[PDB]
Each structure stands twice: as structure tokens, then as C-alpha cells.
Amino acid sequence: MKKLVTATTLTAGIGAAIVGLDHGNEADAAEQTQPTNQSTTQSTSGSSANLYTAGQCTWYVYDKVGGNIGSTWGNANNWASAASSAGYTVNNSPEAGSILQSTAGGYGHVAYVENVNSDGSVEVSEMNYNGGPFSVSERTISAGEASSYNYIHLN
Fold it and tell me: d(Cα 101, Cα 124) in Å, to the nearest integer?
């Protein structure tokens, strides 16, 4: 008597950690006769002669890049943003045949990458002008400082 049989029963349900993957809209392909030797990242082609005013840092860059970029970008400060908005390839990867964006200085500054060394030093050609109509110089920037800029690659 007195001793009460207490039931220590407790119902415990176990849940499941399920995960959902990401998958949205696809992209559109273009068409043109252009023998490319590299693996081209899907980018558009605003290829035209230099339509920019003669004297701004963006001007000689537009000519150095063969005019394969859209003049509709504006100043060097916007170039990388407009590139993305236009369907181009913008990465901080130091590579030849690309434009590096500074943004600093106010309206931004840019130059054309002639060549990149294994050392990491990036040689960007910029026109000094003071001296002659084609007074240009290949500014060899250090890897650390160079990687600090946004490179627009033409694929």
C-alpha cells in the first residue's frame, strides 16, 4: 500500500533537416563570326571606333582596347558598374587585355593592361600626353596594389 507506481513515459518526436537548392532563369546566346582562342565567359560586344572626347584618361584606354567596349559607360568611376549592367566580365583578376578601375580621384581613373608578370606586377599602359600626341607609358603596378582594382575582361 501507499507506494504509487509512477509512469516515467515521455513521447519524443524527431524532426528532419531538409535542404533546398538554388535554380532560377537561364541566359540568351548571341551570334557573330569571331575566331576566339580562349574560353569565353558569356559577354556582350559593344565594338566601335573611339567615340570619346580626346583628353580624358578613359579616351586612350578606349583606343588601346580596340574600342570593343561600349562608350555608353561614361566616366571611369562607373565603367565596371556599367560593364556589369551591359553584360561584360568584371573581376579583380590581374590579366592582359583588360581595363583596371581605380574609382578614386573623383571621376575615377583607368588604364589598359599590356601584360602581367608571374611576379604579379601588372603593366598598364596610360597616356601622359605632356610631350607629344602619343606620349604613352606602360605603368608597372605592384601585385598588391594592382589586385586592389576592378579588371574588365573582354570575353
Answer: 11
Half-sphere exposure at residue 68, Cβ-oriented, CA atoms within 13 angstroms: 17
Identify the helix (H) or strand (E) that includes residue 99: strand 98-101
Is-contact 56 111, C-beta < 8 A? no
Q: How many CA atoms lie within 13 A of 126 on its CB side?
A: 16
Find out whether 88 and 110 touch, Cβ atoms under 8 Å.
no
Q: Assess contact for 150 and 76: CB atoms under 8 A.
A: no
- Which ranges in the chain belong to alpha helices (H)? 57-64, 76-86, 143-146
Which candidate, 54, 63, 61, places its Cα nearest to that of 80?
61
**Could you say which DSSP state residue 72 is in?**
G
CA distances from 65 to 22, 82, 97, 98 (A): 37, 16, 7, 8
CATH label, 56-155, candidates 3.40.50.150, 3.90.1720.10, 3.30.565.10, 3.90.1280.10: 3.90.1720.10
Distance in angstroms (rounded) separating the CA atoms of residues 140 and 135? 16
- Whether residue 151 contacts residue 122, with contact meaning beta carbons closer than 8 Å, is answered with no
| Method for this entry | NMR
